[PDB]
Symmetry: C3
Subunit: 135 residues, 3 copies
């Protein structure tokens, strides 16, 4: 009864690990020796992109589960997949040029807002179930 949410969650976790791998590969390709994170423009775009993704990850997960638990698992699950796609655009877009990140960024933040909305409605509706009203 959370099996769909669980699946999306494992998919997104693999995406985030994939992004971390690219930064590791970029460190070798452009000779950026740890702990440094600057010194090659190509590396800096890859690093910053991965950083923005990893920052937003827990926000996506919460919003995903609250929507799926309190509104509809199937609908949240589908939005979740489109979000995973949006960041795929964002990451690879940025990596090529800072201005190519904007599509994937707008898509994934649109989805996140909708998930927030659905989660808020469902939680509200669900709160009225201890006032016995179901709208």
């Amino acid at each position: 009864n959370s099996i769909l949410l669980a699946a999306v969650s494992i998919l997104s976790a693999c995406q985030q690990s994939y992004f971390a791998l690219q930064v590791g590969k970029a460190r070798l390709k452009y000779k950026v020796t740890p702990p440094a994170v600057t010194g090659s423009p190509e590396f800096e775009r890859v690093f910053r992109a991965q950083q923005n993704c990893v920052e937003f990850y827990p926000i996506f997960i919460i919003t995903l589960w609250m929507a799926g638990w309190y509104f509809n698992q199937v609908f949240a699950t589908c939005l979740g997949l489109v979000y995973i796609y949006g960041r795929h655009l964002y990451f690879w877009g940025y990596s090529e040029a800072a201005k190519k990140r904007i599509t994937g960024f707008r898509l994934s933040l649109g989805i996140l807002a909708l998930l927030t909305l659905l989660g808020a409605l469902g939680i509200a509706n669900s709160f009225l179930d201890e006032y016995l009203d179901l709208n």
Copy 2:
């Protein structure tokens, strides 16, 4: 279900975190910091670092929030959760004005976090001694 209050707080805090990210985006435009760079303007640098410290601790807050709410008391955890959200509001805007103006909101939100950790640890412990060692 018996997580409805936790769920509400969680959605509120997630909105706060997205709001912080928006401010960094606005600051990038106001102080002309060309991506992927995050240095150059001191005003931008304070806003960026503040949002970074918030986003780092966010998953730690969520775990501690739910463990406290699940294994100790949902209503008590829920209330602390709201005050934490407020403390982070002070921290972020405080830091944005001056590096030393962050300290109030910092102490508040980390105090709460420690208490939530405490409650979570007790409840989990009590539940563990009741479930594998038959001691409540």
Copy 3:
């Protein structure tokens, strides 16, 4: 029952807060004035280590719970403990020298992939009988 998962989760959250404390201590030891995060090489090692940990934390939590819920709580719990240990090695290793991070890094990523695997099997096996 999720009491074992709950315990590991609170343990790891304490580790993460501990790492953040060390960065705070490093700011004072090497005079790195906020909001700056560069200058002292040793500080940059401590900071980057804590940053790699805090990035991967939500990934560990999700995979930990999915494995524990859909595969086995006791087995996931044990792997969870080994991950916590691997991160302990990573952090302190890296703090001394970038090349001392490698052991704790391999250990913790081994665990993470297995947790992902177990979670995926359990969810699948789970979905195979509707």
